[PDB]
Amino acid sequence: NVSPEARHPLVAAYPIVHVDMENIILSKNEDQSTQNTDSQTRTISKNTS
Amino acid sequence: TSRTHTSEVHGNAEVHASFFDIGGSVSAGFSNSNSSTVAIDHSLSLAGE
């Protein structure tokens, strides 16, 4: 794989690597909740006077 | 406990019609009071939910 330009005892063979970003996916760490509640009551009283 | 003190004014006027009799009864009235109002009230309830 040593490219044929660098097949001469006077031309150096070496890699040049660099990294490039194509996307950045940021995702907000956050929690929800929901709730649904019913209730029923019976009040039986007394009252004298 | 309670203590009612009901006072009052009045003004009245009446005339009666007869054969040879006539007369005007014009009136005015006032009557205070010294009361005593007291009560004992009991109650139960039952609230089931």
Coordinates of N, CA, C and O in Angstrom, one line a residue:
Chain A
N1 N 0.8 -1.2 0.0 CA 0.0 0.0 0.0 C 0.8 1.3 0.0 O 0.3 2.3 -0.2
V2 N 2.1 1.2 0.2 CA 3.0 2.3 0.1 C 3.0 2.8 -1.3 O 3.5 2.2 -2.2
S3 N 2.5 4.0 -1.4 CA 2.1 4.5 -2.8 C 3.4 4.7 -3.6 O 4.4 5.1 -3.1
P4 N 3.3 4.5 -4.9 CA 4.5 4.3 -5.8 C 5.3 5.6 -6.0 O 6.4 5.5 -6.6
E5 N 4.8 6.8 -5.6 CA 5.6 7.9 -5.5 C 6.7 7.8 -4.5 O 7.9 8.2 -4.8
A6 N 6.4 7.2 -3.4 CA 7.3 7.0 -2.2 C 8.0 5.7 -2.3 O 8.3 5.1 -1.2
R7 N 8.3 5.2 -3.5 CA 9.1 3.9 -3.7 C 10.5 4.3 -4.1 O 11.2 3.4 -4.7
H8 N 10.9 5.5 -3.7 CA 12.3 6.0 -4.0 C 13.1 6.2 -2.7 O 12.5 6.9 -1.8
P9 N 14.3 5.7 -2.6 CA 15.0 5.8 -1.3 C 15.2 7.2 -0.8 O 15.8 7.4 0.2
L10 N 14.7 8.2 -1.5 CA 14.8 9.6 -1.1 C 13.5 10.3 -0.8 O 13.5 11.5 -0.5
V11 N 12.4 9.6 -0.9 CA 11.1 10.2 -0.7 C 10.5 9.4 0.5 O 10.4 8.2 0.4
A12 N 10.1 10.1 1.5 CA 9.6 9.5 2.7 C 8.2 9.0 2.6 O 7.4 9.6 2.0
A13 N 7.9 7.9 3.2 CA 6.6 7.2 3.3 C 6.1 7.3 4.7 O 6.7 6.8 5.6
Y14 N 4.9 8.0 4.8 CA 4.4 8.3 6.1 C 2.9 8.6 6.0 O 2.5 9.2 4.9
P15 N 2.1 8.4 7.0 CA 0.7 8.7 6.9 C 0.3 10.1 7.4 O 1.0 10.6 8.3
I16 N -0.7 10.7 6.9 CA -1.3 12.0 7.4 C -2.7 11.8 7.6 O -3.5 11.8 6.7
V17 N -3.1 11.6 8.9 CA -4.5 11.2 9.3 C -5.1 12.4 10.0 O -4.5 13.0 10.8
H18 N -6.4 12.7 9.6 CA -7.1 13.6 10.4 C -8.6 13.3 10.4 O -9.1 12.6 9.4
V19 N -9.3 13.7 11.4 CA -10.7 13.3 11.6 C -11.6 14.5 11.4 O -11.3 15.6 11.8
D20 N -12.7 14.3 10.7 CA -13.7 15.3 10.5 C -15.1 14.9 10.9 O -15.5 13.8 10.7
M21 N -15.8 15.9 11.5 CA -17.1 15.6 12.1 C -18.2 15.9 11.0 O -18.2 16.9 10.3
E22 N -19.1 15.0 10.9 CA -20.2 15.1 9.9 C -21.6 15.4 10.5 O -22.4 15.9 9.8
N23 N -21.8 15.0 11.8 CA -23.0 15.3 12.5 C -22.7 15.4 14.0 O -21.7 14.9 14.4
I24 N -23.6 16.0 14.7 CA -23.5 16.0 16.2 C -24.9 15.9 16.8 O -25.7 16.7 16.6
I25 N -25.1 14.8 17.4 CA -26.5 14.4 17.9 C -26.6 14.7 19.4 O -26.3 13.8 20.2
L26 N -27.1 15.8 19.8 CA -27.2 16.1 21.2 C -28.6 15.8 21.6 O -29.6 16.2 20.9
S27 N -28.8 15.2 22.8 CA -30.1 14.7 23.2 C -30.3 15.0 24.7 O -29.6 14.5 25.5
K28 N -31.3 15.8 24.9 CA -31.5 16.4 26.3 C -32.0 15.3 27.3 O -33.1 14.9 27.2
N29 N -31.2 15.0 28.3 CA -31.5 14.1 29.3 C -32.5 14.7 30.3 O -32.1 15.5 31.1
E30 N -33.8 14.2 30.2 CA -34.8 14.9 30.9 C -36.0 13.9 31.0 O -36.2 13.1 30.0
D31 N -36.7 13.9 32.1 CA -37.7 12.9 32.4 C -39.1 13.6 32.5 O -39.2 14.6 33.1
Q32 N -40.1 12.9 32.0 CA -41.5 13.3 32.2 C -42.2 12.3 33.1 O -41.7 11.3 33.4
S33 N -43.5 12.7 33.4 CA -44.4 11.8 34.1 C -45.8 12.4 33.9 O -45.9 13.6 33.6
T34 N -46.8 11.5 33.9 CA -48.2 11.9 33.9 C -48.9 11.2 35.0 O -48.4 10.3 35.6
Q35 N -50.1 11.6 35.3 CA -50.9 11.1 36.4 C -52.4 11.3 36.1 O -52.7 12.3 35.5
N36 N -53.2 10.4 36.6 CA -54.6 10.5 36.4 C -55.3 9.9 37.6 O -55.0 8.7 38.0
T37 N -56.2 10.6 38.3 CA -56.6 10.2 39.6 C -58.1 10.4 39.7 O -58.7 11.4 39.3
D38 N -58.8 9.4 40.3 CA -60.3 9.5 40.6 C -60.4 9.4 42.1 O -59.5 9.1 42.9
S39 N -61.7 9.7 42.5 CA -62.0 9.8 44.0 C -63.5 9.8 44.1 O -64.2 10.5 43.3
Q40 N -64.0 9.1 45.1 CA -65.4 9.1 45.4 C -65.6 9.1 46.9 O -64.8 8.4 47.6
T41 N -66.7 9.7 47.4 CA -66.9 9.9 48.8 C -68.4 9.8 49.1 O -69.2 10.1 48.3
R42 N -68.7 9.3 50.3 CA -70.0 9.3 50.8 C -70.0 9.9 52.3 O -69.2 9.3 53.1
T43 N -70.7 10.9 52.5 CA -70.8 11.5 53.9 C -72.2 11.4 54.4 O -73.1 11.9 53.8
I44 N -72.3 10.7 55.5 CA -73.6 10.4 56.1 C -73.5 11.1 57.5 O -72.8 10.6 58.4
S45 N -74.3 12.1 57.8 CA -74.2 12.9 59.0 C -75.5 12.8 59.8 O -76.5 12.1 59.4
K46 N -75.5 13.5 61.0 CA -76.5 13.5 61.9 C -76.5 14.9 62.5 O -75.4 15.5 62.6
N47 N -77.7 15.5 62.9 CA -77.7 16.8 63.5 C -78.9 17.0 64.3 O -80.0 17.1 63.7
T48 N -78.8 17.0 65.7 CA -80.0 17.3 66.5 C -79.7 18.8 67.1 O -78.7 19.3 66.9
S49 N -80.8 19.3 67.7 CA -80.7 20.7 68.2 C -81.7 20.8 69.3 O -82.9 21.0 69.0
Chain B
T1 N -74.9 30.3 72.7 CA -75.7 31.1 73.5 C -76.0 32.5 72.8 O -75.2 32.9 72.0
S2 N -77.1 33.1 73.2 CA -77.5 34.4 72.6 C -78.5 35.1 73.4 O -79.1 34.5 74.4
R3 N -78.7 36.4 73.2 CA -79.6 37.2 74.0 C -80.3 38.2 73.0 O -79.7 39.2 72.7
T4 N -81.5 37.9 72.5 CA -82.2 38.7 71.6 C -82.8 39.9 72.4 O -83.3 39.8 73.5
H5 N -82.7 41.1 71.8 CA -83.3 42.3 72.3 C -84.0 43.0 71.2 O -83.4 43.8 70.5
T6 N -85.3 42.6 70.9 CA -86.1 43.1 69.8 C -86.9 44.3 70.3 O -87.7 44.1 71.2
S7 N -86.6 45.5 69.8 CA -87.4 46.7 70.0 C -88.2 47.0 68.8 O -88.0 46.4 67.7
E8 N -89.0 48.0 68.9 CA -90.0 48.3 67.8 C -90.6 49.7 68.1 O -90.8 50.1 69.2
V9 N -91.0 50.3 66.9 CA -91.8 51.5 67.0 C -93.1 51.2 66.1 O -93.1 50.2 65.4
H10 N -94.1 52.0 66.2 CA -95.3 51.8 65.5 C -96.1 53.2 65.4 O -95.8 54.1 66.2
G11 N -96.9 53.3 64.4 CA -97.9 54.3 64.2 C -99.1 53.9 63.4 O -99.0 53.5 62.3
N12 N -100.3 54.0 64.0 CA -101.5 53.4 63.4 C -102.6 54.5 63.4 O -102.5 55.5 64.2
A13 N -103.6 54.3 62.6 CA -104.8 55.2 62.5 C -106.0 54.4 61.9 O -105.9 53.9 60.8
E14 N -107.1 54.4 62.7 CA -108.3 53.7 62.3 C -109.5 54.6 62.6 O -109.5 55.3 63.6
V15 N -110.5 54.6 61.7 CA -111.8 55.2 61.9 C -112.9 54.2 61.6 O -112.9 53.5 60.6
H16 N -113.9 54.1 62.5 CA -115.1 53.2 62.3 C -116.3 54.0 61.9 O -116.6 55.1 62.5
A17 N -117.1 53.5 60.9 CA -118.2 54.1 60.4 C -119.5 53.5 60.9 O -119.7 52.3 60.7
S18 N -120.4 54.3 61.5 CA -121.7 53.8 62.0 C -122.7 54.9 61.6 O -122.5 55.8 60.8
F19 N -123.9 54.7 62.2 CA -125.0 55.6 61.9 C -124.9 57.0 62.5 O -124.7 58.0 61.7
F20 N -124.9 57.1 63.8 CA -124.6 58.4 64.5 C -123.3 58.4 65.2 O -123.0 59.4 65.9
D21 N -122.5 57.3 65.1 CA -121.3 57.1 65.9 C -120.1 57.3 64.9 O -120.1 56.8 63.8
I22 N -119.1 58.1 65.4 CA -117.9 58.2 64.7 C -116.7 58.4 65.7 O -117.0 58.7 66.9
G23 N -115.5 58.2 65.2 CA -114.4 58.3 66.1 C -113.1 57.8 65.4 O -113.1 56.8 64.7
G24 N -112.0 58.5 65.6 CA -110.7 58.2 65.1 C -109.8 57.7 66.1 O -109.5 58.4 67.1
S25 N -109.3 56.4 65.9 CA -108.4 55.8 66.9 C -107.0 55.8 66.2 O -106.6 54.9 65.5
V26 N -106.2 56.9 66.5 CA -104.9 57.0 66.0 C -103.9 56.5 67.1 O -104.1 56.8 68.3
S27 N -103.0 55.6 66.7 CA -102.3 54.8 67.7 C -100.8 54.9 67.4 O -100.4 55.4 66.3
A28 N -100.0 54.4 68.3 CA -98.5 54.3 68.2 C -98.1 53.3 69.3 O -98.5 53.4 70.4
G29 N -97.1 52.4 68.9 CA -96.8 51.4 69.8 C -95.3 51.1 69.8 O -94.5 51.5 68.9
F30 N -94.8 50.5 70.9 CA -93.4 50.1 71.2 C -93.4 49.0 72.2 O -94.0 49.1 73.2
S31 N -92.6 48.0 71.9 CA -92.5 46.9 72.9 C -91.1 46.2 72.7 O -90.8 45.6 71.7
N32 N -90.3 46.4 73.8 CA -88.9 45.8 73.8 C -89.0 44.3 74.3 O -90.1 43.8 74.6
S33 N -87.8 43.7 74.5 CA -87.8 42.3 74.9 C -86.5 42.0 75.5 O -85.4 42.6 75.1
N34 N -86.5 41.2 76.5 CA -85.3 40.6 77.2 C -85.4 39.1 77.1 O -86.1 38.4 77.8
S35 N -84.7 38.5 76.1 CA -84.8 37.1 75.7 C -83.6 36.4 76.3 O -82.8 36.9 77.0
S36 N -83.5 35.1 76.0 CA -82.4 34.2 76.3 C -82.5 33.0 75.3 O -83.3 32.2 75.4
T37 N -81.5 33.0 74.4 CA -81.5 32.0 73.3 C -80.2 31.1 73.5 O -79.1 31.7 73.4
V38 N -80.4 29.8 73.6 CA -79.4 28.9 73.9 C -79.7 27.6 73.3 O -80.9 27.2 73.1
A39 N -78.7 26.8 72.9 CA -79.0 25.5 72.2 C -77.8 24.6 72.3 O -76.6 25.1 72.4
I40 N -78.0 23.3 72.3 CA -77.0 22.3 72.3 C -77.2 21.4 71.1 O -78.3 20.9 70.9
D41 N -76.2 21.4 70.2 CA -76.3 20.7 68.9 C -75.2 19.6 68.9 O -74.0 19.8 69.1
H42 N -75.7 18.4 68.6 CA -74.8 17.2 68.4 C -74.7 16.9 67.0 O -75.6 17.2 66.2
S43 N -73.7 16.2 66.6 CA -73.5 15.7 65.3 C -72.5 14.5 65.3 O -71.6 14.4 66.0
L44 N -72.8 13.6 64.4 CA -71.9 12.5 63.9 C -71.7 12.7 62.4 O -72.4 13.4 61.8
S45 N -70.7 12.0 61.9 CA -70.5 11.9 60.5 C -69.8 10.6 60.2 O -69.4 9.9 61.1
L46 N -69.7 10.3 58.9 CA -69.0 9.1 58.4 C -68.6 9.4 57.0 O -69.5 9.3 56.1
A47 N -67.4 9.8 56.7 CA -66.9 10.1 55.4 C -66.0 8.9 54.9 O -64.9 8.7 55.3
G48 N -66.6 8.1 54.0 CA -65.9 7.0 53.5 C -65.4 7.3 52.1 O -66.2 7.7 51.2
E49 N -64.1 7.0 51.8 CA -63.5 7.5 50.5 C -62.9 6.3 49.8 O -62.6 5.3 50.5

